[PDB]
Amino acid sequence: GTKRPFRQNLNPLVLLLDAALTGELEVVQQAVKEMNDPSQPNEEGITALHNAICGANYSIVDFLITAGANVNSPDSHGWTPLHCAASCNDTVICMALVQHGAAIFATTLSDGATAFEKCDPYREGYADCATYLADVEQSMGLMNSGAVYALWDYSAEFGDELSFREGESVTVLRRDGPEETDWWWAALHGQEGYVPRNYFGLFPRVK
């Protein structure tokens, strides 16, 4: 025990990530106060919220979302918190993410899969989680008078596309245009144009 010298400047992120994973709510709470950024990723693109979800620590998921953890943060492989939650058929976490601004149509980096597609047919809760995510997919651009919330800036690359800012309420006019499966015809400040599905949530972010 003698030999190892003590560290004077421990990294709150390393403590946060470990706590989020093992299930140490109080450690996570103190670590969040300490640093600016709870949503800060490690090398792999893994956040407190990722670890909390894979650890199945519902109390820490809830605390991290409320404190304004990035519900859309992709890891190295383009897996969002919603992808991870779906892969465990975790309907309760899927609901909490969607309700705090998760992008239902977000696609992974390699092979371009949605959260719905990551549901595990050989584990409890498959039907419940698949049903929920498919219902959110259906509901998007239909609920809230077609209003959906931009989760990033976008710059039109053709004249029939709509530019928009992070946070802006965009109104979907037509979804199922057979001409585009990944794009909606939408309205913002009396402009009309195609917007990409995967940029939007059913609810806004927390600040």
Author numbering: 616 to 822
Sentences from the paper on this structure:
We wanted to investigate the structural details of the interaction and solved the crystal structure of the iASPP CTD in complex with the p63 linker peptide. Since the KD for the interaction is with ~90 µM relatively weak, we fused the p63 peptide (amino acids 332‐342) directly to the iASPP CTD (amino acids 625‐828). In the crystal structure, the p63 peptide of one fusion protein bound to the SH3 domain of a neighboring protein of the asymmetric unit. The p63 peptides of all four chains present within the asymmetric unit of the crystal lattice adopted an almost identical conformation with differences only in the orientation of T335, Q341 and F339. No electron density was observed for G332 and D333 at all, whereas G334 was only resolved in one chain. In detail, the p63 peptide adopted the conformation of a class II SH3 domain binding motif (PxφPx + ) despite the lack of one proline. P338 occupied the second xP pocket, whereas R340 contacted D775 and E776 of the RT loop and E795 of the n‐src loop which make up the acidic region of the SH3 domain. p63 R337, at the position of the aliphatic residue in the canonical class II motif, interacted with the RT loop as well by reaching towards E776 of the acidic region. The aliphatic moiety of the K336 side chain partially occupied the first xP pocket. The proximity of the W767 side chain could also allow for a cation‐π interaction via the ε‐amino group of K336. The ankyrin repeats (ANK1 to ANK4, dark grey) do not contribute to the interaction.
The ASPP family of proteins is involved in modulating the transcriptional activity of the p53 protein family members, including p63. Despite their antagonizing functions, the ASPP family members share a highly homologous C‐terminal domain (CTD) which mediates the direct interaction with p53 and consists of four ankyrin repeats (ARs) conjoined with an SH3 domain. Here we characterize the interaction of iASPP with p63 and show that it binds to the linker region between the DNA binding domain and the oligomerization domain. We further demonstrate that this binding site is removed in a splice variant of p63 where a stretch of five amino acids is replaced with a single alanine residue. This stretch contains a degenerate class II SH3 domain binding motif that is responsible for interaction with iASPP, as well as two positively charged amino acids.
